[PDB]
Structure formats: structure tokens, C-alpha cells
């Protein structure tokens, strides 16, 4: 499956793509403002994620740090990034179908649109100014708007037991972005696409 990753932000982002235990394609790359990077994701990929990282520094070997979404200091991500990270999430070729969503469960850093480039389903978007509107207690000093589980580490926010409900903090993400997951047990906003669809992830889709 192809995923065209486009940076429409006025700032550079370092795109990342991983399934948690391995990179997807090269795993990461710098995207200056306006740049497009097309990756190939193996059919059958389950639990894949794409995200942006901001304010990165990498040396010649691809080692360094990002202020948001850092994946163990690597340019080429092999693991998930450090919150806050707006997430484009996907599972492909799952009994003949693809499943996509945007999630704020690990916070928000950069606005994003995640849409198919092929027929048969709609895209999902979280493009509101969540960083600007972020509640004081969730603001990440390193940049971004943290989720409440990251900040407070309680069973209720982290949905440790599976009993959790919505919270004042999850409702903030849900109000700004109704089409993204705001907590672990949120009412799903996952879209079913034909199996083997192709996609485009656009950072800062509106500006």
C-alpha cells in the first residue's frame, strides 16, 4: 500500500512510520514545508502508525532528538514516538478490509488529515488548533498538548482496567476534534476502507 505523506505546515516536520516493533518503509524522514514523501507499507500491516515530529536535530548517523514524537533518538523510527503525537493509525488487509483512524489518545502535536487516495471510503481529520487551546495542565513544555494518561498516570485516564469513562480532559480533545479518538474507550471513529486501499497523510491540512 502506498502512503503519500505531505507536509503542508509552514515549519519542517520529521515524518515517522512504525508498527511498534519495526519501521514501516525507512521509518522516518525530514519533510520541509510543502514536501511529499511516499512510503510503501506491506499488505497485512496491523497496528501501523504515522506521525509528525517537531524541532528535531539529527547528526550524520541519524541520531539525535525531537521535542515531540521522538522515537528513541532516531531519524528512522523503529518504535512509537514519545507523546504528544497526533496519530494516523491503520490496520490493512484485516479480513479483506482496511481500517483507519486518527487518535489523540497519545496527545496532539501537529494537525493532520488521513484520507484514502483510492475509492470506497471517506478520510478522517483532526485539524483544530489543539496546541493553542490546550488546557494549562496538559500543555507540554517541550511542545504540544499531552493526553491526560501521559500527564497523570491514573487508571481512569489510561483505562488500565477497561472500565474508564470520558473525562474533562478527553472531552477537550473530543470537542476540538470529534473525528479522532479522545480516550481508549471512546465511541470509535474508525473508517472501513476496501482492502489494499492507498492513502495520503497531510500535516497541517488547512494552513
Numbering used by the authors: 1 to 207
Task: Tell me, in the authors' exact words, what the paper reports.
In contrast, cryo-crystallography has effectively addressed such issues, leading to the seminal success of synchrotron structural biology. In this study, we introduce a pragmatic high-throughput RT data-collection method, Cryo2RT, that takes advantage of the well established workflow for synchrotron cryo-crystallography. The procedure involves crystal cooling in liquid nitrogen (LN2) at the laboratory, shipping to the synchrotron under cryogenic conditions, as is commonly practiced, and thawing the crystals on the goniometer immediately before X-ray data collection. Here, we used endothiapepsin (EP) soaked with four different fragments, thaumatin (Thau) and SARS-CoV-2 3CLpro (3CLpro) as test systems to show that RT structures can be obtained after the cooling/thawing process. Our Cryo2RT method applies to conventional single-crystal data collection and achieves a comparable throughput to cryo-crystallography, enabling high-throughput fragment-based screening at RT: a highly sought-after method in structure-based drug discovery.
